[PDB]
């Protein structure tokens, strides 16, 4: 696409500038172009990819939720529905764009557990975002695609990563929220959050001061959700 004529390193460099400038749509286009260069991504580059699309899709979701609430209140002219559809279609485009990158070809080229777990979590996250707005003939299939990606990531992380690994913890956090609010399995969500928190606590003693802070930062988010749900 439109980034094919820019160097890979230049795209990475500008993605970092766009992050500092809080230009996340630019950040995403740059990391999209970097991925399409066809080289595997380093740990840092993988985080730049995730952060960019998280913020882009994060604004769309928040906008979708505002409009969706207005729409439902109006159902207690066509403009409210039309504009919610517009935002929704745009949100689905970004989700399809990320899933296209993971499928072509970040996942199949990711042999390391750290990189493969990272991409499969992302895959579950963006099928979940599609699920948040799905309503029709293939909602169930979208949900199952999220479940399956999350489940493979959990199996690999369990085998290949320590219980305090921040990616394993973030994955567990998001799989738990999937269970709670997407799969209507609130008790699965609570068990997973609790078991994840406890097994990380039992492993903190092996960690350095820096890794300790990374892990506990995410253990607190698990605790926050547990506190909200019980």
């Amino acid at each position: 696409g439109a980034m094919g004529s820019m160097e890979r390193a230049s795209l990475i460099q500008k993605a970092k500038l766009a992050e500092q400038a809080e230009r996340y749509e630019d950040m995403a286009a740059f990391m999209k172009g970097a991925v399409e260069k066809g080289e595997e991504l380093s740990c840092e580059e993988r985080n730049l990819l995730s952060v960019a699309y998280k913020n882009v899709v994060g604004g769309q979701r928040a906008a979708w939720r505002v409009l969706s609430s207005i729409e439902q209140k109006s159902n207690e002219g066509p403009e409210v529905r039309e504009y919610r559809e517009k935002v929704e279609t745009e949100l689905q485009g970004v989700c399809d764009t990320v899933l296209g990158l993971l499928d072509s070809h970040l996942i199949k080229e990711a042999g390391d557990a750290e990189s493969r777990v990272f991409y499969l979590k992302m895959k579950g996250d963006y099928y979940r975002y599609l699920a948040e707005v799905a309503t029709g003939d293939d909602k169930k299939r979208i949900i199952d695609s999220a479940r399956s990606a999350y489940q493979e990531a959990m199996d690999i992380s369990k085998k290949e990563m320590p219980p305090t690994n921040p990616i394993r913890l973030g994955l567990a956090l998001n799989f738990s929220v999937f269970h709670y609010e997407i799969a209507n399995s609130p008790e699965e969500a609570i068990s997973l959050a609790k078991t994840t928190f406890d097994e990380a606590m039992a492993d903190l003693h092996t960690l350095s001061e820096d890794s300790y802070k990374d892990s506990t930062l995410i253990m607190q988010l698990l605790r926050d959700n547990l506190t909200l749900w019980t």
Partner: peptide
Amino acid sequence: RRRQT
């Protein structure tokens, strides 16, 4: 609050 991801 809104749950966290």
